[PDB]
Structure formats: structure tokens, C-alpha cells
Amino acid sequence: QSYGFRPTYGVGHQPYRVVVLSFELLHAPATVCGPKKSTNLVKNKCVNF
Amino acid sequence: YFKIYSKHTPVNLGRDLPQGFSALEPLVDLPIGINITRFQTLLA
Numbered sequence A: 001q002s003y004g005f006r007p008t009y010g011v012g013h014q015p016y017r018v019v020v021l022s023f024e025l026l027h028a029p030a031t032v033c034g035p036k037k038s039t040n041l042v043k044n045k046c047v048n049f
Numbered sequence B: 001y002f003k004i005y006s007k008h009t010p011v012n013l014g015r016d017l018p019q020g021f022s023a024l025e026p027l028v029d030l031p032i033g034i035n036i037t038r039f040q041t042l043l044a
């Protein structure tokens, strides 16, 4: 059965665009991962790295 | 982590196999996740 969309009425029957995300953690090498922040660089001081 | 190593030494004149020292450099450490027991060479 078709949805029968309409723009003239309020919420409930409105078009709601949906995108989903699926994740899993299997014993595999890390391939798809997020960003890592990079800081500045300093010299001639006993600092951490 | 399928490792391959390649070395291109053309400095040998060549009759059977050279007698010298050489090293092998890494190219890629790509993973496949499945073990390999047999292989074959593709020729054109």
C-alpha cells in the first residue's frame, strides 16, 4: 500500500528522512576509526610527547 | 597482516643464482583475515 503523502497536514504522517548507523567490534585489526587531535611542536624544553 | 617484501637487483649478470648480500624492504602489511595454504603463479 502506498503511503499517500501530503504537505498540508501536521506531524505524524509527515515525511521524516531517516539514516541509521550500525557498528560492531570483531577481532579484526583497526581499519575504520575516527580522528585523533594533533597539537603544536616545541623544542629545547624537557616536555612530554 | 599479509606481508610482502620486494627487492629489485639487476646488477647480476646471471647464470643460475648470484652470490652476494642483499636486503628486502617492506611494501604493505594489509590484512586478509584468512589463512593461506596453497598458491600459484599467474603467467601471461
Ligand SMILES: *[C@@H]1O[C@H](CO)[C@@H](O)[C@H](O)[C@H]1NC(C)=O
Binding pocket: B035, B036, B037
Ligand atoms: C586454516 O586453513 C584450514 C584449511 O587449509 C582451515 O580448515 C582452518 O580453519 C584455517 N584456520 C583458521 C583459524 O581459520
